Amino acid sequence: GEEFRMEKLNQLWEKAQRLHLPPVRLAELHADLKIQERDELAWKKLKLDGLDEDGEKEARLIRNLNVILAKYGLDGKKDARQ
């Protein structure tokens, strides 16, 4: 039930709100995140129904998430540990 049903998206969403992005720019990253959510969820359903056996459709998606983050400029990776 969380905004989306994919941990990656939820995790990223919580992160954005953490950056506190205004609604407008948050609709941009939230909306796109959703679009990617329709394709990402359609993916979780892909790998579930057995449509992509190598997860490429996940690849393109991930590359679309990566880009999404490189687009808003909210990537990073050296978190948690420090």
Curated annotation (Swiss-Prot):
<comment type="function">
    <text>Molecular chaperone for LDL receptor-related proteins that may regulate their ligand binding activity along the secretory pathway.</text>
</comment>
<protein>
    <recommendedName>
        <fullName>Alpha-2-macroglobulin receptor-associated protein</fullName>
    </recommendedName>
</protein>
<comment type="similarity">
    <text>Belongs to the alpha-2-MRAP family.</text>
</comment>
<comment type="subunit">
    <text>Interacts with the LRP1/alpha-2-macroglobulin receptor heavy and light chains; the interaction is transient and coincides with a reduction of ligand binding by the receptor. Interacts with LRP2/glycoprotein 330. Interacts with LRP1B; binding is followed by internalization and degradation. Interacts with LDLR. Interacts with SORL1. Interacts with LRP1; this interaction is followed by rapid internalization.</text>
</comment>
